[PDB]
Design a protein around this ligand. Structure first.
Ligand code: CUO
Ligand code: CUO
Lengths: 208, 208
């Protein structure tokens, strides 16, 4: 089905990104962080709960629902579009979690980006973000740096096996959560939390 | 010569430190950072130049002089004493650079310390410090994470060979500088700089 392939933008694995590609990304995200969209965009996922603008709030993301992949799919494009506005040359990269990784990706990991072209020292926007409403810094605590296994693959693979979409989604969603808990770990403000997770930039890569 | 061994405090390799020992250290440093001593103590090494309180300033540390090991030796105890005031149970640990290290020490490396006993999320004071006078954050850029070699050993070993103290010092000082450049790298505010280096907490461990 032709519908899956895109003409316009390409999303590549994070490792694949060239220095130039990454450089656009570093900048775009930093600018997005500066711009209004980044904080507000984060809100969509969870806190602050936007779903009911007025009245009791609820987290917006559909989870535990078959709608779930669609929602997140839309979410990623939202950020992607923001990045493009930012001037990102390429689509949000995806961190292939299934593939066993010797180490965490350099792009996310780097605390600071030298960006030699313009002498400047700045934190890597990819590395983290802050949570404006709840004044804090997002944190990550991979308890298990250990992940090197078929386990991700088995879970995903099993999901792949199902013909039924709904059967597929339930399995698919579960594997999806593994990255969140694994990266976030204990940290209250992290990937591990429903509300907080949107803040971390890894979120975008993982969802991609 | 009995003069070398101490009765009172013990300095151990960083790896050796027990979780309890490290915990005291994490706290003590954090408190020292909070206290007045930490920033001021840093000043002794370099900027701001304290040597001439009034008049043209010069960096205080003796370098390129035979006095050099003595000066730094005094410097470490100064911080150590501060730590004890802080309530540190043990002396400043030493990061045996000569030994080839698979990875950088966990104590220094950790960005944040969970410190489960008291639920709190804080940066690791060991990880870094800020430079108050020149508003900035210290940075580290090990260009070469590569260091796994006899090279450190050869240099130090050669130094060991000399009977003459002065002959010894020149060789000794040079090997000493390797850690500074290697950790600091390109970063303007880092171990690599004479003025800035004091700020990084690694400085203490290395000098130890
Ligand atoms: O699910 Cu809402 O975050 Cu991956
Ligand atoms: O020398 Cu003054 O710093 Cu190691």
């Amino acid at each position: 089905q032709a519908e899956v392939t895109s003409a316009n933008r390409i999303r590549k694995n994070i490792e694949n990104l060239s220095l130039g590609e990454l450089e656009s990304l570093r900048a775009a995200f930093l600018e997005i962080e500066n711009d209004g969209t980044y904080e507000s965009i984060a809100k969509f996922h969870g806190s602050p709960g936007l779903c009911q603008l007025n009245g009791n709030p609820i987290s917006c993301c559909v989870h535990g629902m078959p709608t779930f992949p669609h929602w997140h799919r839309l979410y990623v494009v939202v950020v992607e579009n923001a990045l493009l506005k930012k001037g990102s040359s390429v689509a949000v990269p995806y961190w292939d979690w299934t593939k066993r990784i010797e180490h965490l990706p350099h792009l996310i990991s780097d605390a600071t980006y030298y960006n030699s072209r313009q002498h400047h020292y700045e934190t890597n926007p990819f590395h983290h973000g802050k949570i404006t409403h709840e004044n804090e810094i997002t944190t990550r605590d991979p308890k298990d740096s250990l992940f090197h296994s078929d386990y991700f693959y088995e879970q995903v693979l099993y999901a792949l096996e199902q013909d039924n979409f709904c059967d597929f989604e339930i399995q698919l969603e579960i594997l999806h959560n593994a990255l969140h808990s694994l990266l976030g770990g204990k940290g209250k403000y992290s990937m591990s939390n429903l509300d907080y997770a949107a803040f971390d930039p890894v979120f975008f890569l993982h969802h991609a």
